[PDB]
């Protein structure tokens, strides 16, 4: 199937309390594999998946050097953005950055990304052609122009199309037990009485990987979208994911309702009924 690699960086200014808090994390599909935290004692890029632990000191030393270089550029960026938005020295602000690549099911390059947000909103993003920039703010134009003139997109294009997908493929091969696995949802239902005339039927999906999943309810085969409570897919803490979906079923009507589960791990989509 299709795969992705992404890096996510958050830098938060802390006026009067030292240097900005800086956290970087890297993921392949839904599996975290590296981290750096500027507040931690090690000051090194650290492994967070077992398959990356055998990469060796050239990898760790060079990824520690690169990630510290990213910390420093965000440290400068916080000061730059404050100037651009004419903001005071007192307030805490947030820069976020994401980059990475997708390959398709042939494992060939499919899409690349590189984008920034400032205080929770889109600041600048590389466009899909990897040749142009999308910039909404007036302040952001200054960045766009600076980047057009320094040919930042060209450098990013070469990385996203080359290095980024080559290393994604290496990781896929090296972590094939972890990354190229699927864990099928283990499913069940619970039934709990609200009152005498209706009850909540909840359909559960547990221990599944990857996170993408569709869980729906139907009543006589009609979709119950407006009347289904659906919660956000959540991590179990062990690399797997969890989700549930519930409907309110009036008395004597349990047989009308089916829960439908779609997931890459299933040999065929499930149809579950309380019976």
């Amino acid at each position: 199937g299709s795969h992705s690699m992404r890096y996510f960086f958050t830098s938060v200014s802390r006026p009067g309390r030292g240097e900005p808090r800086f956290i970087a994390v890297g993921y392949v599909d839904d599996t975290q594999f590296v981290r750096f935290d500027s507040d931690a004692a090690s000051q090194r890029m650290e492994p967070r998946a077992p398959w990356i632990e055998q990469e060796g000191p050239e990898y760790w030393d060079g990824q520690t050097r690169a990630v510290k270089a990213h910390s420093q550029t965000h440290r400068v960026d916080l000061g730059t953005l404050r100037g651009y938005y004419n903001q005071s020295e007192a307030g805490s602000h947030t820069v976020q950055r994401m980059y990475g690549c997708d390959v398709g099911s042939d494992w060939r390059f499919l899409r690349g990304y590189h984008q920034y947000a400032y205080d929770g909103k889109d600041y600048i993003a590389l466009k899909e052609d990897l040749r142009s920039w999308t910039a909404a703010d007036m302040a952001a134009q200054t960045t766009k122009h600076k980047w057009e003139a320094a040919h930042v997109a060209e450098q990013l294009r070469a990385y996203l199309e080359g290095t980024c997908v080559e290393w994604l493929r290496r990781y896929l091969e090296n972590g094939k037990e972890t990354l190229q696995r699927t864990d099928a949802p283990k499913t069940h239902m619970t039934h709990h009485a609200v009152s005498d005339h209706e009850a909540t039927l909840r359909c559960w999906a547990l221990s599944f990987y990857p996170a993408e999943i569709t869980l729906t309810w139907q009543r006589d085969g009609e979709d119950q979208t407006q009347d289904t409570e659906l919660v956000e897919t959540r991590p179990a803490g062990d690399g797997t994911f969890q989700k549930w979906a519930a409907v309110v079923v009036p008395s004597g009507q349990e047989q009308r309702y089916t829960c439908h589960v779609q997931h890459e791990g299933l040999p065929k989509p499930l149809t579950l009924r309380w019976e």
């Binding site: 730059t80 980059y99 600048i124 600076k146």
Partner: peptide, 9 residues
């Protein structure tokens, strides 16, 4: 593997 070149806004 990280991008190896500095980018400043």
């Amino acid at each position: 593997l990280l991008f190896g070149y500095p980018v400043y806004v």
